[PDB]
Design a protein around this ligand. Sequence first.
Ligand code: GDS
Ligand code: GDS
Ligand code: CL
Ligand code: CL
Lengths: 222, 221
Amino acid sequence: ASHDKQFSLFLHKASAHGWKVAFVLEELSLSYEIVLVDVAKNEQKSPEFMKLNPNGRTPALIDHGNSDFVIWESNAMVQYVADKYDTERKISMAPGTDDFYIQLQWQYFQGTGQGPYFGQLVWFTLYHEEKIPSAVTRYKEEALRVFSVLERVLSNQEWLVGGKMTIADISFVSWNDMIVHFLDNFDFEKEFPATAAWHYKMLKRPTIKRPWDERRKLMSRQ
Amino acid sequence: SHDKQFSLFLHKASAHGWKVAFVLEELSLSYEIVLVDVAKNEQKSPEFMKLNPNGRTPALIDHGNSDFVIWESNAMVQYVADKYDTERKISMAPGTDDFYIQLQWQYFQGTGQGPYFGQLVWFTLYHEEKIPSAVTRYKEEALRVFSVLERVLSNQEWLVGGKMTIADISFVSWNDMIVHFLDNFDFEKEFPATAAWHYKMLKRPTIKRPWDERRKLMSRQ
Ligand SMILES: N[C@@H](CCC(=O)N[C@@H](CSSC[C@H](NC(=O)CC[C@H](N)C(=O)O)C(=O)NCC(=O)O)C(=O)NCC(=O)O)C(=O)O
Ligand SMILES: N[C@@H](CCC(=O)N[C@@H](CSSC[C@H](NC(=O)CC[C@H](N)C(=O)O)C(=O)NCC(=O)O)C(=O)NCC(=O)O)C(=O)O
Ligand SMILES: [Cl-]
Ligand SMILES: [Cl-]
């Protein structure tokens, strides 16, 4: 509000979800200011943040270029910015097309399949009040299953939809980079070669590397 | 093998396929239910994985659109509503701000209600080990989901656009299924606005009819 960027992006630094939106904003050359919402201090349950998102979870977006339009759910945030602002369709499918709905299917797989299950692996590994190996194993195996699904497609085609990198592919990047540290003796390239190549190719793009380097800086020992 | 516009592949006990059936009914679109029995691991069959590489129900084939195949229940709903609800009886207009609010709520359903409700069911009934702290974690999360809905629905009739849409409809099947997994739970007493909203939708014949079909199928092994 007291910055001149088109978007306010509210995120928690350790989360996969806000940075995903940042990747897309960078790709689309849209200006944004990050506003940190510190989940470690329970700031996501503050009245201020819950006015933005009644779910009380990060991230959320305010589009100051559209009369301060507020939207949450990281995948819906991505869809909103791509549909409205990716005029040249550099990284998104045209609305209405069959491909748009396949692009949507893949984002729902990311949001409902990758995200919550990766999140439960992290939860039972680090944050649950007791250590439960059967629960950790359940979600470790699920993470590997998710990689296998991606591999089954990406070993046969370059990108998830439309013959080029889109918001569907981009949406997996942050969680995929985060999760490898929670898997046993994990060699990404060895175990899922096509998925690894796809992941690392995206991560080399300066539009994606810059915010990801910023996350690393924010989380690093100051 | 049938003359209906859609083949809807679902598992009878799942919340997700019936949600799609509700929307098909609302839009007077013809469909044939094709059961994929998860109890027999049919969701990992070669035939089904050709439809959905994730190997989870449901999936859709639109025989009115060159046998278009799509999976993820919320994406299936969006496709059907965007393409066929031209009068916008139960959906927001594509492109509009309200479309993205409608999308936000469907993602809350798909990423927030569904997976957490599903883990409650999992740790209650299906996990090899019985783990009280896991059951507690997801019971509390289910109640939290209701509290989010209540925060909104106590102040406005519908989630978006001043009308019942696919956003509201998407919560119905799971909200009926979950209450049997909660202790000492009186929906109306605990979350009065959410309860009234839910019960109103469940009463619609477009929703009750497929839900009664679910009951029928559930009753027979
Ligand atoms: N579908 C939503 C998901 C949004 C989401 O997951 N937001 C997280 C980002 S913080 S990152 C994920 C977060 N981790 C934690 O809460 C651990 C914090 C640790 N104790 C500390 O002190 O830092 C978490 O929610 N773990 C449990 C789980 O995933 O089920 C959040 O706000 N969580 C806070 C809350 O729920 O109150 C979207 O895509 O936008
Ligand atoms: N985001 C997807 C979710 C799709 C989904 O959850 N599909 C389920 C429907 S069956 S219902 C949910 C299912 N239940 C079970 O696996 C127990 C089944 C019992 N024995 C019976 O016979 O009904 C399950 O996946 N429980 C664990 C969890 O939710 O994490 C499925 O195919 N599961 C099979 C699989 O994953 O192999 C969508 O919305 O489309
Ligand atoms: Cl975030
Ligand atoms: Cl199903």
